[PDB]
Amino acid sequence: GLSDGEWQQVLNVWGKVEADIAGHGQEVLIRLFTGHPETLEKFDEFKHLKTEAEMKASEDLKEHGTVVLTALGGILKKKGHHEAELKPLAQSHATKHKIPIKYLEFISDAIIHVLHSKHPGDFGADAQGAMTKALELFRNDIAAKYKELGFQG
Ligand code: HEM
Ligand SMILES: [Mn+2]
C-alpha cells in the first residue's frame, strides 16, 4: 500500500493529466503500440494503424485513449479501495479481450514515459516513486483476479 503523503503525490500528478486527458491518452496508447506492436493486434479497430502517424490521425483512437485514462483516474481517486471498480475490468480483460498481465506492465511503463515527456523537469523523483507504486498496486490487484480465473497469461 501507499502512505497518505504518497497518495497526495499521485493525485497531485493526476491534476496535470486532467488538464487534457485526451492528449495524454493518445500519447499513452501510441507509446504502447509503437514500443510493443503485438499489443495493437488486440484491437479490432485499430490494428490497421501500424505507424505513429496513422495512429495520430484517428479520432477514434483518441476517444479510446480518453475512456482508458478516465477509468484509471476513477480508480486512483479510490486510494486503493477499488475492488468494485477493478473486478469488471479484470474480468473483461481476462475473458473477453484476453490481455496478458505483461501488457499491463507495458502500459504502466508507457504512462511514466509520457509523464516525463510531457512535463520535463516537472515530474519529480518523489512523484515518480509514488506513481510507480500506485500502478504496481493496480497491476497486482488485477493479477490476483487473473489467477482466480486461471488466465495463464
Ligand atoms: C490502465 C489500463 C487499462 C484500462 C483502465 C483499460 C480500460 C478499458 C475499458 C474501460 C474498456 C471498455 C469496457 C471493457 O471492455 O471493459 C476497455 C476495453 C478494451 N481494452 Fe482496456 N484497459 C486497460 C488496458 C488495456 C491494455 C494494456 C490492452 C491491450 C494491450 C487493452 C485492450 C482492450 C481492448 C481490446 C478493449 C476492447 C475495445 C473495443 O474493441 O471496443 N486494455 N479497456
Ligand atoms: Mn470497439
d(CA 67, CA 36): 21
Query: CA separation (Å) from 32 to 37, 50, 85, 86, 108?
Result: 8, 12, 23, 21, 9
Range of the domain at 121: 1-153
In this structure, the residue with its CA closest to atom 25 of ligand 1 is 104
Buried b (16+ CB within 10 A) or exposed e, 92-119: ebbeeeebbbebbebbbbbbeebbeebe
| Cβ atoms < 10 Å from Cβ of 140 | 11
113 is in an annotated binding site: no
DSSP H helices, 3-153, are 4-18, 21-35, 52-56, 59-76, 83-95, 101-118, 125-149
Q: What is the CATH number of the domain that holds 86?
A: 1.10.490.10
Query: From the CA of 121, how far away is ligand 1's center (Å)?
Result: 30
**What is the Cα 76 distance to its own chain's centre?**
11
Is the CA virtual torsion 60, 65, 68, 71 positive or negative? negative
In this structure, the residue with its CA closest to atom 9 of ligand 1 is 68
Query: CA separation (Å) from 67 to 5, 25, 125, 148?
Result: 28, 8, 28, 26
Count how many domains the chain has. Answer: 1
| Cβ atoms < 10 Å from Cβ of 53 | 9
Ligand 1 in reach of 102 Cβ (< 6 A): no
49 contacts 26 by C-beta, under 8 angstroms: no
